[PDB]
Symmetry: C3
Subunit: 216 residues, 3 copies
């Protein structure tokens, strides 16, 4: 409803100062309950990805990544249809917040972030890297289909989602793997964790990870 | 508008959480929906997770419900009846020990009568379960709180085992017992499932949930 | 809609919401606000305006932030001083403090009345009789005190209490309680800069859980 809230940004302007699950209205005016981060970097971010404790299985198939999964009480992926619905007219920016197991925070911010629809297999349109202490380990994945174990759309003679137990805009294969296994800090296994290459490397799996959008 | 966690899943709520539904009498009830386990679409009426909430409670409290949407809770006997009376609901219990071993038992049908009949347990055959069958034993028995004794033992099961349950003479499951945190010396007064981890082990997590 | 609907967590309990959680109530001015209702503790029906539970949220914050509120419905939060005032402006609500240590010991402390003035009077605290509580009175001490943050010193100490004790509070000179202090996780060497309650576990112990909540008497 034109005079209803359509982003976490709106809700903030309208005086909801507490982070939490609010329902918003998408461009097409269908209602959708989302998590609003009202605290970080000015606040007003819609969170589409959350990892926090390893409670939820993220090594999932296409249908599952399509529709979303997890729990409002915990970890979740908002779902690719929704993430597209939310970024349709790409004027909204991306923030990535990582917290390690000693509670050290790092992050990264992009100017624009858009995922295409299923027809173009949730393609990643990412505008410029603006800054962040995590370094830029997403640009590398610009202009690439999203792949999962049962649907391969990567640039690797093998199946990247299996080789790195995740779901992602995989090329050959990745520099970031935020949907990887919740490995809890330093791990021997190679690059199959919640990893950000310019952050804590290919052998460290963050304690917390959030991916979130706001109109620019 | 929706009448079960099952409906909500059908209409495309894929994320577990607290949604409001509509009882067949029509009072709306905000319930926890487990959209993940075993196909999803389960309404959770009991959750233990961390020992934050006191479960050694009286009749009025078990009647109306207690605890926190943020944590542990009992949905309340009136609601559990409202919720399982009309049409047939299937039970299912998920159990997690402190060494993270997942377990369950699952029943064809599960119904609790109203207060007049003491929220009596009406249970169907065991479908399957790695936790074994530690509930059929309690079928056709009244509910008992500490302050109310409907148990078929001349002592007071509820107080001997500090919980609440359709206690008989007395129990082979005690999912509303004390949050004892794994192995305990004390006898059968924990979150215990006899064919599961035994009378001397209190699970880390416990959930009781229903689906059409 | 402002009239038909609920105005306190007490009403909601009366209306048959038996489960603790976030419900919307209507301020005396008709503005909707989403509050946390503790339907379980001490008869139930309490509106929670402060919660600490895991150390996930930064509480060492400025005036504007304490004014408007901050944190997460999923976790820790301060409801905001304007709201806490809005809620107690009619002067007839009981205060309850629920604390839990890292041994799972539960202590509480209760007061007959609790009111914070508006911003003009710097959220001045008006507190009534200590009714009882296993945690001891560590609040009466802070009667009649303005609320202070790091960037706005309104205390009775030639120095800055919020800085020294890394929190925010009705600091006097400075405190016997510091429930908005740093989440230090049990025993700490540093002096009185934790989630501390002096008559409770002392100046060198930071509780695992803390909640401050109100209910119409
Ligand atoms: C709350 O505390 C105040 C003082 O604290 C200030 O105000 C509060 C609300 C906050 O803003 C704080 O930050 C401030 O620091 C107490 O006020 C005092 O009360 C006592 C009585 O209990 C008064 O004592 C009287 O003194 C009078 C003397 O003449 C004049 O003195 C000064 C000038 O020197 C003048 O400001 C004052 O108003 C008098 O005109 C006299 O009437 C009589 O003999 C009596 O002894 C004292 O004056 C008050 N102080 C101030 C700063 O005005 C409140 O009592 C307390 N409230 C409660 C309920 O406890
Ligand atoms: C873990 C996962 O994502 N797999 C699914 C579901 O999508 C599959 O269809 C099913 C196999 O028929 O397993 C599960 O039920
Ligand atoms: C809560 C609040 O308003 N304070 C902020 C910011 O303004 C501060 O500079 C910082 C202190 O280094 O804490 C925070 O980052
Ligand atoms: Ca391939
Ligand atoms: Ca008896
Ligand atoms: Ca000062």
């Amino acid at each position: 409803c034109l005079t209803g809230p359509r982003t976490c940004k709106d809700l903030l302007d309208r005086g909801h100062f507490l982070s939490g699950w609010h329902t918003i209205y998408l461009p097409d005016c269908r209602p959708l309950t989302v998590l609003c981060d009202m605290d970080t970097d000015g606040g007003g971010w819609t969170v589409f990805q959350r990892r926090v404790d390893g409670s939820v299985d993220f090594y999932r198939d296409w249908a599952t990544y399509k529709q979303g999964f997890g729990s409002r009480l915990g970890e979740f992926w908002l779902g690719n249809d929704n993430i597209h619905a939310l970024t349709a007219q790409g004027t909204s920016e991306l923030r990535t917040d990582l917290v390690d197991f000693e509670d050290n925070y790092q992050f990264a911010k992009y100017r624009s972030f858009k995922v295409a629809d299923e027809a173009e297999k949730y393609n990643l349109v990412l505008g410029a890297f603006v800054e962040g202490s995590a370094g830029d380990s997403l640009t590398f994945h610009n202009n690439q289909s999203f792949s999962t174990k049962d649907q391969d759309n990567d640039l690797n003679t093998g199946n990247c989602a299996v080789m790195f137990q995740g779901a992602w805009w995989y090329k050959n294969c990745h520099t970031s793997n935020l949907n990887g296994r919740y490995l809890r800090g330093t791990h021997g296994s190679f690059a199959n964790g919640i990893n950000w290459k310019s952050g804590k490397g290919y052998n460290y799996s963050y304690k917390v990870s959030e991916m979130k959008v706001r109109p620019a």
